Write a protein that binds this ligand. Structure first.
Ligand SMILES: CC(=O)N[C@@H]1[C@@H](O)[C@H](O)[C@@H](CO)O[C@H]1O
Length: 398
């Protein structure tokens, strides 16, 4: 008798991000194409000894949220964005890759209460519709990138319960969660936290690591297979792993990457840790030479440091490379595009996978058939004239 109604939740890197670099121009976003904007990022004042941002080390503000000058300035624009789209909801996302402070903020009644008061204060001062927590990651700490402890799982749940209690009726509380199968298994009590959250944003991307070629494939590739089992990921695999853990699909948004990654397999040996003497018997080897790495370096991507390539830069620099060095392809099983570059020997070398309008629309179709609540994407500043967001809006009937 009636139609479904899907979210499209766009993260926007306004303040700067560890992996994605300096913040974008908020004025370039077409906010009519999204249901929700997660302005990223608020950071957390913290006492982690390895924190290298001196502002966050201010002990008088421990456990509070820090908003940089750009963040403050960008948030002053919300009245203009809301006139542009009076349906739009705007949240602040706190955290992000490499962001410290969650483990300590979560750790005691007193720390949780300071954090929650700071969340309430920020919501009221900037008139936000809610808060998104992007803790990467409870328990695991992204393998030591931020502080962590096993009490993180239970503490997160408590933080979220207390936060849900404190938040005005009508305000949104959401989180982003990782792709890794240990996230729902071990790091985050997804069933326990489900009742406190309006929706959950699945980071179904950043898969182009270890022995895997694709960054955000929907299903596994067969033409370009991942070799080590522990690296074998797809957006669908991740979704299924969260579903097995007891979440209802309508509470989930499928995260979509408006970017690509050069897989680490191109430049670093791929280790299968289930093998005998794993570090000396890599199961994949690097297929880029100085010739391929120099091309990326010349484009401002230093592959010894980062593999991140914005969609708009994929378009302008790779697809539209004047020297025609990159050839576009479609992986039929993974349901995403990828590029190859020609080796000196004449062989296609897998350079990068990403998302284009076709693949975004296929992920939308998957959202509709799997019965997910919507899409989320990282991140709006990387779109090309708002085309991928527009696609999503069209495909989801936003
Ligand atoms: C190096 C680091 O701090 N973080 C992780 C890595 O350890 C992880 O195993 C991989 C997923 O396969 O994702 C990176 O973004």
């Amino acid at each position: 008798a009636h139609a479904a109604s899907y979210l499209s939740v766009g993260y926007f890197n306004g303040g700067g991000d560890v992996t994605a670099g300096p913040g974008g121009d908020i004025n370039k976003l077409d906010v009519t194409q999204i249901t929700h904007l997660n302005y990223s990022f608020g950071l957390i004042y913290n006492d982690e000894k390895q924190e290298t941002n001196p502002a966050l080390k201010d002990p008088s503000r421990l456990h509070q949220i820090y908003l940089s000058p750009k963040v403050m300035a960008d948030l002053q624009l919300l009245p203009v964005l809301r006139k542009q789209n009076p349906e739009l909801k705007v949240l602040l996302s706190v955290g992000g890759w490499g962001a410290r402070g969650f483990s300590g903020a979560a750790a005691t009644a007193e720390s949780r209460a300071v954090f929650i008061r700071s969340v309430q204060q920020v919501i009221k001062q900037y008139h936000l519709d809610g808060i998104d927590l992007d803790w990467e990651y409870p328990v695991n700490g992204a393998w030591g990138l931020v502080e962590s402890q096993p009490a993180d799982r239970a503490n997160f749940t408590l933080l979220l319960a207390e936060l849900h209690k404190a938040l005005d009726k009508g305000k949104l509380l959401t989180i982003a969660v990782g792709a890794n199968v240990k996230s729902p298994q071990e790091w985050v009590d997804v069933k326990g936290i489900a009742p406190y959250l309006d929706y959950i944003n699945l980071m179904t991307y950043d898969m182009a690591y270890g022995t895997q070629y694709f960054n955000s494939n929907l299903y596994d590739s067969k033409q370009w297979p991942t070799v080590a089992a522990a690296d074998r990921y797809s957006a669908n695999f991740v979704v299924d792993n969260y579903l097995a853990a007891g979440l209802k699909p309508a509470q989930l948004n499928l995260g979509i990457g408006f970017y690509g990654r050069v897989p680490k397999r191109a430049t670093e040996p791929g280790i299968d840790w289930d093998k005998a003497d794993a570090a000396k018997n890599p199961v994949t080897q690097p297929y880029f030479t100085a010739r391929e790495t120099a091309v990326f370096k010349a484009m401002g991507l230093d592959l010894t440091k980062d593999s991140y390539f914005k969609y708009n830069d994929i378009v302008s620099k790779l697809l539209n490379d004047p020297q025609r060095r990159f050839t576009a392809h479609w992986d039929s099983d993974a349901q995403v595009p990828y590029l190859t570059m020609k080796s000196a020997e004449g062989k296609p070398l897998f350079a990068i996978s990403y998302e284009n309008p076709r693949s975004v629309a296929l992920k939308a179709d998957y959202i509709k058939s799997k019965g997910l609540g919507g899409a989320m994407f990282w991140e709006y500043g990387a779109d090309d004239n708002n085309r991928l967001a527009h696609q999503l809006a069209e495909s989801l009937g936003i």
